[PDB]
Amino acid sequence: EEDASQLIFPKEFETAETLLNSEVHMLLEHRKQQNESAEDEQELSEVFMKTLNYTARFSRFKNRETIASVRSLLLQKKLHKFELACLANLCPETAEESKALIPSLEGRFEDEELQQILDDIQTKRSFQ
Template identity: 80%
Template sequence: MASSLSSLPPHVNETFEEDASELQFPKEFENAETLLISEVDMLLEHRQQQNESVEDEQELSEVFMKTKQYCSRFSRYKNRETISAIRSLLQSKKMHKFEFAQLANLCPETPEEAKALIPSLEGRFQDEELRQILEDIQTQRSFQY
């Protein structure tokens, strides 16, 4: 009894090439929301504080602690107001949610750096428009301290 590819479920036959530079993501990500590293850091901090406030405090997993450490290290925004301002700024642009999250997380300094880090921006945004977006992000970051 030989099995053939045609007997496999339809989704197994499909070959989907994920390519972030072309904004091609698996179907599971279509309705997913993106979070900034700073938002994840705040969520993990809240969870850690909740855990510490209960009487029978549970030891947090190594993965949790390493993720928290990573997020704390690479968090760009220190408060909810700044995150909200960055989200509003970037959501007002015609940008894919992946591009939005990457720009906010990586904070490139120049349009050239932004396009090198996020290739899908190439051809979708003029350098001057991107420069203005990056300057606006930096302005918001400077107001948070």
């Protein structure tokens, strides 16, 4: 019934906002600092831990401010909450690839423009 490749999502996830793995990581990092300090609270869940590591391991923008610039950059482009977060997480490098991974992007922009967005994202990438 649902299919992200056509931006067909369930109702529940409509009024929702997407999060980059980087943002998730930042948020989870804060929740940990809270659990750590201020005792009288059980260790966090396995689900947390696994998400904390996965998220970190795939965070492409390690700086808080950087993250915001990526978000805003894409934000001002006719993109779906899903499409935005997906471009930031997967960072494809070419429009072709881009369209392949996120078919919903087809026909939204000229390859030229789409390649601009991809290239800008790469620029914010906090390589290592």
